[PDB]
Design a protein around this ligand. Structure first.
Ligand SMILES: [Cl-]
Ligand SMILES: [Cl-]
Ligand SMILES: [Cl-]
Ligand SMILES: [Cl-]
Ligand SMILES: [Cl-]
Ligand SMILES: [Cl-]
Ligand SMILES: [Cl-]
Ligand SMILES: [Cl-]
Ligand SMILES: [Mg+2]
Ligand SMILES: [Mg+2]
Ligand SMILES: [Mg+2]
Ligand SMILES: [Mg+2]
Ligand SMILES: [Mg+2]
Ligand SMILES: [Mg+2]
Ligand SMILES: [Mg+2]
Ligand SMILES: [Mg+2]
Ligand SMILES: [Mg+2]
Ligand SMILES: [Mg+2]
Ligand SMILES: [Mg+2]
Ligand SMILES: [Mg+2]
Ligand SMILES: [Mg+2]
Ligand SMILES: [Mg+2]
Ligand SMILES: [Mg+2]
Ligand SMILES: [Mg+2]
Ligand SMILES: [Mg+2]
Ligand SMILES: [Mg+2]
Ligand SMILES: [Mg+2]
Ligand SMILES: [Mg+2]
Ligand SMILES: [Mg+2]
Ligand SMILES: [Mg+2]
Ligand SMILES: [Mg+2]
Ligand SMILES: [Mg+2]
Ligand SMILES: [Mg+2]
Ligand SMILES: [Mg+2]
Ligand SMILES: [Mg+2]
Ligand SMILES: [Mg+2]
Ligand SMILES: [Mg+2]
Ligand SMILES: [Mg+2]
Ligand SMILES: [Mg+2]
Ligand SMILES: [Mg+2]
Ligand SMILES: [Mg+2]
Ligand SMILES: [Mg+2]
Ligand SMILES: [Mg+2]
Ligand SMILES: [Mg+2]
Ligand SMILES: [Mg+2]
Ligand SMILES: [Mg+2]
Ligand SMILES: [Mg+2]
Ligand SMILES: [Mg+2]
Ligand SMILES: [Mg+2]
Ligand SMILES: [Mg+2]
Ligand SMILES: [Mg+2]
Ligand SMILES: [Mg+2]
Ligand SMILES: [Mg+2]
Ligand SMILES: [Mg+2]
Ligand SMILES: [Mg+2]
Ligand SMILES: [Mg+2]
Ligand SMILES: [Mg+2]
Ligand SMILES: [Mg+2]
Ligand SMILES: [Mg+2]
Ligand SMILES: [Mg+2]
Ligand SMILES: [Mg+2]
Ligand SMILES: [Mg+2]
Ligand SMILES: [Mg+2]
Ligand SMILES: [Mg+2]
Ligand SMILES: [Mg+2]
Lengths: 185, 99, 159, 53, 148
RNA sequence: GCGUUGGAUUGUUCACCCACUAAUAGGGAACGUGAGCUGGGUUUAGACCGUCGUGAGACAGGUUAGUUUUACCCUACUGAU
RNA sequence: GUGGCCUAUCGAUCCUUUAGUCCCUCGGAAUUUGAGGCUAGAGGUGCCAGAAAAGUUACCACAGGGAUAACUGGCUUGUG
RNA sequence: AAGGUAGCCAAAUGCCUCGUCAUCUAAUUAGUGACGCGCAUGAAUGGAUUAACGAGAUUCCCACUGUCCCUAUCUACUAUCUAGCGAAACCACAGCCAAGGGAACGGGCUUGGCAGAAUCAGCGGGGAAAGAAGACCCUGUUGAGCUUGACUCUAGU
RNA sequence: GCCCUGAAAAUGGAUGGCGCUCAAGCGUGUUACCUAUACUCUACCGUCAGGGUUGAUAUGAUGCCCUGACGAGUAGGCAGGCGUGGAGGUCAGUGACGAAGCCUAGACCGUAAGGUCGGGUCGAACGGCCUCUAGUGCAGAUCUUGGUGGUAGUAGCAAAUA
RNA sequence: AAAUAUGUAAGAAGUCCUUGUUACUUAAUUGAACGUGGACAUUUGAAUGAAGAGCUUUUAGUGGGCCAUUUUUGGUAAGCAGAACUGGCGAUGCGGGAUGAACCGAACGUAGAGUUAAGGUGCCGGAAUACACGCUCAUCAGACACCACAAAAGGUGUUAG
RNA sequence: GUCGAAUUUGGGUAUAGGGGCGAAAGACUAAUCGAACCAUCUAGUAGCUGGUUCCUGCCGAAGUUUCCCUCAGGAUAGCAG
RNA sequence: GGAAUACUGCCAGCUGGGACUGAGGACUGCGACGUAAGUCAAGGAUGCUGGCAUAAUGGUUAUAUGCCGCCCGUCUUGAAACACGGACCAAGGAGUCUAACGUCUAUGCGAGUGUUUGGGUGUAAAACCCAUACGCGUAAUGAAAGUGAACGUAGGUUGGGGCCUCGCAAGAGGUGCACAAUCGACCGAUCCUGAUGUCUUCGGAUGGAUUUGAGUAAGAGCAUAGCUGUUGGGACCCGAAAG
RNA sequence: GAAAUUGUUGAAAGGGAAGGGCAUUUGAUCAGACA
């Protein structure tokens, strides 16, 4: 007998492979598995793990977010790397001439980058140009702006959004939400 | 029957709803019969265009008043200004609305 | 039925000490408390205002707010399987400065002095405390201290 | 029929499965409950030093 | 599909996952929203504050078409111009050649000012406008025309 | 080891008397023993009285009338091949 | 000094009513009554997190319970 | 409001109670006749008394008798055996005991006693035998019959 | 201290039984010896964790390989698999020279759900693999319908004169 | 006025020096709070350990318990009723206590070898009818924790004091 | 027990389910009566009893808190995946 | 006065007998012995020999012997129970479908998204093509009339993966997305302050407040599918006394 | 033309049930390699 201080036969809890069956996505995983093993470059390990993420863990990154990151000191000529989808943003009226590597580009995003003089490349093209992630900049989208997050942690004095179907005067604004009706939260 | 953090539901199924369930299995069948009806009507009616001429009217309400659509029929004054009578217009393929 | 009032079971906890009743000495009101000070809670039974609940008797916390005659103390309370932070508004008569860390500041000052004096001369400053160590070898002399033999005593009543 | 009234048996063992966790400490703690007059002036002190820097 | 459900896994396990003690009975606790104030109060006071009671004043025969007024922000104002013409107007910022934008024709009621527009004169026609939205349009050299 | 009874009254266990007798000792065995009996009592439905209750009805109060089923199986036992 | 030296002395939704703001609505357009909203109290639930509620069954019924009484048996032996 | 009159009684109505006295017997918690501060008798919610009648409820006497002392014998039909005919209840597996422990009373478990094919007629100790999802009791936010200035109504008037 | 008196219950009876008296009893001390799914070492299975390896010309990078640790389980959760009716694709699959079914203390594979083969009986259809779909797996519910036992050649087949 | 339990502290979010902001505060640039700039590295502030730490969503079953040592209330007492801490049974086999849900030992993939635990070694029954010093003779001896019982009071039985 | 009558009885006929009929027992109304039988509403509801169908692998509980006409049930927090 | 021996301990001292095991499969390592070549017990067994080649070993099955083994299912703190169902066998026999939803995952497109109400077309309930609307999302907040989201590199501070500069390295410096804590700014509500001007009661500029919101602050959603969970439905299957 | 259940024939065991687990004896029966 052994006095165990922790649970036995416990899985790591991290994804070691993508859950999807996309054949082309598996090829990229195979490419960066080889690179992460034989380069000791921190960039390759980050990209490989990002390929395993689910859809909600890879929020879209707009071109306006890309332009803002290029305005950082000394980042004007760096290659923007997004493991996910790059979307278009019409709220911005000026775009730089950078190089962007991403899994997917929307029609508007690709046209806007090319019209400004830049180029859109895939992740395998990035590996040929920068096998060790030279002069790269990794951008991630916002996870907590998702609609589902605002309902998490509901309770008294928490200031979270209730799970409701119809919003209006007669829908959960009575007793429990104002002092004139019993009490307020 | 209230548990966990879930939205309040309002499903109205406390009557004999299973006695009044209508599944549109014949959606494809009715489309064929409608096309057959239009084909038979056109061959039978006349070489006329199978539908009457409609006017252009302003949609009511502040939400839709920015668009024009097809109305019921031409007014008596509109028909008179075109140079023909309402009785003759109805027999020539022009919809006439008197109200 | 059961009784669970605010000051229940505090018959002896809130009593004054023996021959220590009456007014509070003025040094209690002259001490200065600032945000970040570590204080301990001990309710005074003669001051009914700003009195802590019996749970916080003997607890130690950190001051976060200073008011006219009171201070605000942060207390971590174990509720269920977690700790929750509690904020108390207590008058100065019920608190005092904690000596659990005033001595620690002295060691901090002493470490710097020994660190600086060794900075120019000796390596391995050795500014870490150690627990009690086993005794070293020694020689015991019998000069004027010849051992005296002892034996167990017989049983007696002497009642 | 009667039944048991109260017991704390097995409760500590349940609490030690995942619990007995010290609170996480943050610098810049919440200013809730601090004197409003102090906060009113502390706001103006921060505004002035931001302009200087 | 039925072949991937846990019912197929529960075959041969007596209770089918419902437990031996509690069992799977018909309606323990009532049906629907029963007991919302007596034995389901805790689950209603949390997760659903404000459920019980009435607040406002009634409105007999409400027509939602009276309140139709979609909002448009200034940061989205230039999207109403077709893309093939945006470039020429942006680079030809001048008077006497200001593009005209009919916001009502695009299905919006009121103009709100949130973002920043280019410093280009634009003629904006709308039914309603906020005070801030008009100021930013005039600051760029444009004008606001009220329509109905 | 060997015996420890016959009766009057009571459904009674209990109790109390009469009489004989060497003696009329106390108890257990699912408060032994109902497919062994009996059914007087208690404890279904009918009915009467007293007290109680506005009433329907109540009463460890009294009174009267009220279906006691099956062994051919196994074992045990008694006899028999 | 924001009631009683401290530790008890008390009450939701709906409805009614009062005070305040004299503000918002009655949706074809107005004025005046009336009604409806906004903020703060009172009228009470003592089974006190708050259904509006008399008996009887020896004519009885159903779902159950050895989670629970009327026999043995077991633990105990005050009492005998 | 009036305080039980005439009568009657340990009565089918008296708790205490096997009340007290007398009678009946060798012996009587029974019966009868008396007595009455009657727990809680009583006058058409009828009181008291009554000849005749009663498959009504009780006590005693005579006759009579196997009710009993105390059992014995006889007849018919069964049971029994054979030919023919031929079911049912019930059945987890089954069927020898003593003690132990055990859900506090074992056919099985533990330790001992023991233990020899196949069987027939009897027998009622056991199989906590069979016959019915206890009619008693309690529980359920399950009923029904009946009653009442319970709550809410209603035909009629 | 040991022993004895004090010390009476019901079927026959239990230091577990036999039996044991300088014990095979009681108190105490010293060694040898017996044996658990526990401990130590080794093999094998699985699980988890940390790693190696894409180079063409030989097949699985969900592949192959190296290292270490671990393994009880009701209610319950999750994962990988087995089997059945029907459907799309494929094996130009099997078959009157015998398909399916059934019987078989005959053989083989898998930890198992199961799969495969031989022999007998039989007579017209049926299977492997990749996917789709469900009225898809029984020992019980005083379960439903149908069939069949022990009881058992047993109870019994004796009113109404023959 | 203990013992056992119990709060806090043992550094980089730290210490030291100089001086910037404010409508707060002071008779007063006095103080308070937050900062700019400079110095001090991991024997950087006790011990041991650390199958890595932190964090989030969602849902199952359960919401009749019971037993043992110690503390403890009611009751004559109970295999009775009710609490406290911990360990157990329930959910758990295996060796031992003849037998037993809870006691003792020890927790479990399939095998081989070795050594042990608690308990035992006359026979049933694997293992010394081993060794050593004493005690005991019962006409109802005695024989191993939980545990399946015995007391007050007595004996010129025998032993030691 | 009764046996010349308040007698026994055939046939015809009348009364139908909250109704009938009753020299009155809650009796009888087709083996059914303290509210008949038949079909439908109806697969009526049940916090209560019973049952709930293949294998292996890994992890692994709770009978406790607060509220409830809550005490054989739920909500809630905890424990678990 | 001089030894021996007992007891306890140490040896990188030597040596005999017995049992169980042989995992791996070119080489690579660390050592030992030798001047050297090489050898070796050094990162897991080889060498030599005999009998038999078939029921001999072994498998299966029946039986015997030693030890062990109580009847399953169920409710329960506790079942072999003197607790309940089960005489036997075959076939049938119980978490399903639907409307609306939560979390998670896969897919398409993305500030958008949804062809299938309908129309066109057809090898005809299939496949293919399509206009206008509509739904949800892109703005919130008030009971309402209403109003409506940049002082600033879309703010400051602290911690941050990755990248950049230097360095052999360690480190130092720069930039720092996501995310966590905190201080501000912006929009609506509430309570105040009430400018220039006036249908003299209208208008609400400016500046605040231990107040309040399911907000803003370089968008993330829409559609389809799947497991699990929720509610209404006969609702996992069978069962009342009643009305 | 399955099972419950039954007849005949053959084999085997049986002192108050039968059935089961680990191991081997005995009887019966059977596959694999002869490189
Ligand atoms: Cl407990
Ligand atoms: Cl599963
Ligand atoms: Cl009454
Ligand atoms: Cl005989
Ligand atoms: Cl298999
Ligand atoms: Cl009728
Ligand atoms: Cl044997
Ligand atoms: Cl408003
Ligand atoms: Mg299970
Ligand atoms: Mg069940
Ligand atoms: Mg339940
Ligand atoms: Mg008896
Ligand atoms: Mg009888
Ligand atoms: Mg009997
Ligand atoms: Mg009788
Ligand atoms: Mg009676
Ligand atoms: Mg006073
Ligand atoms: Mg006071
Ligand atoms: Mg109107
Ligand atoms: Mg209450
Ligand atoms: Mg009981
Ligand atoms: Mg006594
Ligand atoms: Mg008399
Ligand atoms: Mg009298
Ligand atoms: Mg009178
Ligand atoms: Mg016996
Ligand atoms: Mg039995
Ligand atoms: Mg035996
Ligand atoms: Mg019953
Ligand atoms: Mg019944
Ligand atoms: Mg209840
Ligand atoms: Mg009723
Ligand atoms: Mg001894
Ligand atoms: Mg396991
Ligand atoms: Mg064939
Ligand atoms: Mg066979
Ligand atoms: Mg044929
Ligand atoms: Mg089925
Ligand atoms: Mg079956
Ligand atoms: Mg079953
Ligand atoms: Mg049956
Ligand atoms: Mg016969
Ligand atoms: Mg007969
Ligand atoms: Mg005859
Ligand atoms: Mg329960
Ligand atoms: Mg249980
Ligand atoms: Mg014992
Ligand atoms: Mg031996
Ligand atoms: Mg007659
Ligand atoms: Mg009656
Ligand atoms: Mg059903
Ligand atoms: Mg485990
Ligand atoms: Mg209530
Ligand atoms: Mg139950
Ligand atoms: Mg052999
Ligand atoms: Mg045995
Ligand atoms: Mg019980
Ligand atoms: Mg059982
Ligand atoms: Mg039952
Ligand atoms: Mg039965
Ligand atoms: Mg079947
Ligand atoms: Mg039914
Ligand atoms: Mg009703
Ligand atoms: Mg045939
Ligand atoms: Mg057969």
């Amino acid at each position: 007998g052994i006095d165990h201080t922790s649970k036995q036969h416990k899985r790591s809890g991290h994804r070691t492979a993508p859950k999807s069956d996309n054949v082309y996505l598996k090829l990229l995983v195979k490419l960066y598995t080889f690179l992460a093993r034989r380069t000791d470059a921190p960039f390759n390990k980050v990209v490989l793990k990002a390929l395993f993420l689910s859809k909600i863990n890879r929020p879209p990154v707009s071109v306006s977010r890309i332009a803002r990151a290029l305005k950082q000191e000394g980042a004007a000529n760096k290659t923007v790397v997004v493991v996910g989808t790059v979307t278009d943003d019409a709220r911005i009226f000026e775009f730089p001439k950078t190089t962007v590597a991403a899994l997917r580009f929307t029609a508007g995003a690709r046209a806007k980058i090319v019209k400004a003089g830049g180029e859109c490349i895939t992740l395998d093209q990035l590996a040929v140009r920068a096998p060790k992630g030279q002069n790269t900049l990794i951008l991630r989208g916002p996870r907590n702006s998702r609609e589902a997050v605002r309902h998490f942690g509901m309770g008294p004095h928490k200031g979270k959004a209730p799970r409701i179907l119809s919003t209006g005067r007669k829908f959960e604004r009575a007793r429990g939400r104002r002092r004139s009706k019993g009490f307020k939260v | 029957a209230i548990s966990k953090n879930l939205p309040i539901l309002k499903n109205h199924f406390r009557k004999h709803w299973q006695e009044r369930v209508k599944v549109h299995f014949d959606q494809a069948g009715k489309k064929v019969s409608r096309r057959n009806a239009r084909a038979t009507r056109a061959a039978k009616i006349a070489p006329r265009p199978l539908d009457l001429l409609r006017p252009v009217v302003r949609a009511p309400t502040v939400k839709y008043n920015r668009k024009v659509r097809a109305g019921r029929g031409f007014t008596l004054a509109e028909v008179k200004a075109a140079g023909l009578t309402a009785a003759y217009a109805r027999t020539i393929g022009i919809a006439v609305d008197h109200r | 039925g059961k009784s669970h009032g605010y000051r229940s079971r505090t018959r002896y906890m809130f009593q004054r000490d023996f021959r220590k009743h009456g007014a509070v000495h003025l040094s209690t009101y002259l001490k200065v408390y600032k945000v970040g000070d570590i204080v301990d809670i001990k309710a005074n039974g003669s001051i009914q205002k700003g009195m802590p609940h019996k749970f916080y008797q003997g607890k130690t916390g950190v001051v976060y707010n200073v008011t006219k005659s009171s201070v605000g103390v942060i207390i971590n309370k174990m509720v269920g399987n977690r700790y929750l932070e509690k904020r108390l508004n207590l008058r100065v008569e019920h608190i005092k400065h904690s000596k659990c860390r005033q001595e620690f500041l002295e060691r901090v000052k002493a470490n710097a002095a020994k660190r600086a004096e060794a900075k120019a001369q000796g390596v391995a400053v050795q500014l870490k405390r150690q627990p009690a160590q086993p005794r070293e070898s020694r020689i015991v002399s019998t000069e004027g201290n010849v051992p005296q033999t002892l034996a167990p005593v017989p049983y007696e009543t002497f009642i | 029929a009667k039944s048991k009234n109260h017991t704390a048996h097995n409760q500590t063992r349940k609490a030690h499965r995942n619990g007995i966790k010290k609170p996480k400490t943050y610098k810049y703690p919440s200013l809730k409950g601090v004197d409003p007059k102090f906060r009113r002036n502390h706001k103006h002190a921060l505004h002035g030093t931001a302009k200087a820097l | 599909p039925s072949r991937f459900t846990k019912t197929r896994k529960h075959r041969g396990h007596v209770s089918a996952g419902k437990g031996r003690i509690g069992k799977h009975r018909k309606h323990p606790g009532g049906r629907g929203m029963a007991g919302g104030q007596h034995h389901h109060r805790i689950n209603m006071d949390k997760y659903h504050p404000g459920y019980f009671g009435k607040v406002g004043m009634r409105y007999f025969h409400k027509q939602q078409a009276h309140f139709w007024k979609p909002v448009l922000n200034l940061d989205k104002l230039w999207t109403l111009i077709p893309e093939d013409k945006r470039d020429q107007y942006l680079k030809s910022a001048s008077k006497e050649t200001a593009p005209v934008i009919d916001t009502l024709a695009a299905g919006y009621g009121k103009i709100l000012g949130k973002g920043r527009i280019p410093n280009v004169p634009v003629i904006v026609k709308a039914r309603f406008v906020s005070k801030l939205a008009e100021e930013k349009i005039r600051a760029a050299g444009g004008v606001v025309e009220l329509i109905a």
